[PDB]
Amino acid sequence: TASLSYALCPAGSRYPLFGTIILDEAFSRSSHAVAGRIIAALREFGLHAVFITPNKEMRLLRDHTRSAIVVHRRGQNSNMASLSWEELERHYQRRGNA
Amino acid sequence: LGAKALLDPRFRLEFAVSVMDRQSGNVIESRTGSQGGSGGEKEIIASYVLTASLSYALCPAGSRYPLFGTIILDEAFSRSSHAVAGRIIAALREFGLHAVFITPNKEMRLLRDHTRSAIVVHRRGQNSNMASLSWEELERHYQRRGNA
Amino acid sequence: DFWDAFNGLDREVLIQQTLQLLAKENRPVGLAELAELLPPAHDLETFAVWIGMAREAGIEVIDSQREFAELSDGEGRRWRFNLPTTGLESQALMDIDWE
Amino acid sequence: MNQVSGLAGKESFILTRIELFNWGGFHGLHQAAIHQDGTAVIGPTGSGKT
Amino acid sequence: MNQVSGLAGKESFILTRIELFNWGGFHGLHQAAIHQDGTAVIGPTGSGKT
Ligand SMILES: Nc1ncnc2c1ncn2[C@@H]1O[C@H](COP(=O)(O)OP(=O)(O)O)[C@@H](O)[C@H]1O
């Protein structure tokens, strides 16, 4: 991340012109103690981070991102929808009636 | 390999994992390996096939129970969803092995359902230790004369 | 599974609540006592967290000594937890800076 | 947290949208929204995240 | 699934206890029991479980 942050800064500029950094399998081996430091360093270097997780450490994502893309499989076709954390919380509350 | 494929029984046949439809019996995936796959899906393929091969190796011919039964799984389910790890544990149970899972506090609610003890490990400074825990179910009655 | 994970434990909240309880009681408190006074909805992970804080501050745990507890779920199921013997102290936990 | 988030959108380009069509298992058109402050993509194993 | 463990420990041997001394970061004697019906080892990063 540090190397990329340097690389994407145009000569004579302190902030990278391109800011989006992906992380597939973002935290597959890191407990919260390490993932928090990862997040802090990632944000420190000026990048905006897009994370992917297969339903792991859900609480951590809620604490450092504002929207989530919920993708589900159905046969041979996959659907994608974009929601905010609060809309998803309301959806869960609707399931809270059960 | 030229002479192996003539004098060695193990090289007289070529193996391939396959997926069968439960109802019709038509094969869908003649998986010869794990090239492609999503990961996690890769994990379940690997775990299923390796547990099968382990049961083969550890079992004398004609024995349903391997005389050694324990298996270890480091970073178990590190990239598999709850639904996939559940079926992985189901396959492990069907083969009859006793599973020792390791995880960095991930998928805790899943192990909760399929284990009955835990060994916490913690580090401070240049030292580390462990401690033991266990749990069980009071099946006698959820609530007497209630809904259960 | 999606909503089970979405309903996951919030570690820092438990850190703070345990600190407040230790401030209130201001005495050695066992793990079973913490379970009774702070009934967890994620029992096993909360116990793991509790032993983690205990070891982080240097508060040792007597593994060979056993204490017990009782808990329940939302569906009426009940479980009896076998635990080690240890006692938390507010001062040591506060002296440690948490992450 | 938003105090640090002021950097995003101000200094650098930030990802905000992705549009697919018949790519993988995504039959027909699709689209996903990315918040300037950070997004998390979630779903069951093997569904289309990658 | 869990109750099928009754065959384990009867038809086969299974691990039930481990012991360490001056191994890795584990200074001095240490002990950990393993339950018949399966177990899980849990801790933070670099704890020592591997
Ligand atoms: N090009 C492909 N090669 C192999 N499998 C594919 C391919 N495209 C789609 N698949 C199927 O669609 C999914 C693609 O993998 P994906 O779900 O994106 O990985 P991940 O779960 O790690 O994000 C898988 O479920 C896979 O079965």
Ligand SMILES: Nc1ncnc2c1ncn2[C@@H]1O[C@H](COP(=O)(O)OP(=O)(O)O)[C@@H](O)[C@H]1O
């Ligand atoms: N041979 C080694 N080489 C480098 N570091 C080591 C070695 N042995 C132990 N360590 C240290 O001791 C620990 C060994 O790894 P470990 O704690 O078991 O990983 P994890 O907890 O993620 O399973 C690490 O904290 C590591 O820093």
Ligand SMILES: [Mg+2]
């Ligand atoms: Mg993927």
